[PDB]
Design a protein around this ligand. Structure first.
Ligand code: CA
Ligand code: CA
Ligand code: CA
Ligand code: CA
Lengths: 19, 142
């Protein structure tokens, strides 16, 4: 799940920035 | 703590392709394009500027960690996660398959085996249906 967490954060990092 | 901090770092590293310690506008557009996004140079600058505290043109780890650590409002976090699920769920069928998880993981540069991906699906697949639904993604994402 560390692969999930790590990846989710990255995908989330883009969302945050996209604002 | 050290953990979430290190998680955030590992994420940072998905972005910082060169390992120079900073995410340039080019690295941002790279990761974005991988994930089916297609931002214009303009957007990419505005994006990098939104979080470049030291006005140095690039975003370093502590600028990232700062973004990544900001308090996201509940209703907002939920929204953020829905949008994230939608990056995995490419077909938009409300379920994340192993095919989709494989694409995302691979585009992000992450290197895993078909067995590892299947494992990720497995661990997150509480309802044993071979696919990861929204609540499973959330249960896993938090
Ligand atoms: Ca870099
Ligand atoms: Ca900076
Ligand atoms: Ca799907
Ligand atoms: Ca399921």
């Amino acid at each position: 799940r560390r692969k999930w967490q790590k990846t989710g954060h990255a995908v989330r990092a883009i969302g945050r920035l996209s604002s | 703590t050290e953990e979430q901090i290190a998680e955030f770092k590992e994420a940072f590293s998905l972005f910082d392709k060169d390992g120079d310690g900073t995410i340039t506008t080019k690295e941002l557009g790279t990761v974005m394009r991988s994930l089916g996004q297609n931002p214009t140079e303009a957007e990419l600058q505005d994006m990098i500027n939104e979080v470049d505290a030291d006005g140095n043109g690039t975003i370093d780890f502590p600028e990232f960690l700062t973004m990544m650590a900001r308090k996201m409002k509940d209703t907002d976090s939920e929204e953020e996660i829905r949008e994230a699920f939608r990056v995995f769920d490419k077909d938009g069928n409300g379920y994340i398959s192993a095919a989709e998880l494989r694409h995302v993981m691979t585009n992000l540069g992450e290197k895993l085996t078909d067995e590892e991906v299947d494992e990720m699906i497995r661990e997150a697949d509480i309802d044993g249906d071979g696919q990861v639904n929204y609540e499973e993604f959330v249960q896993m994402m938090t």
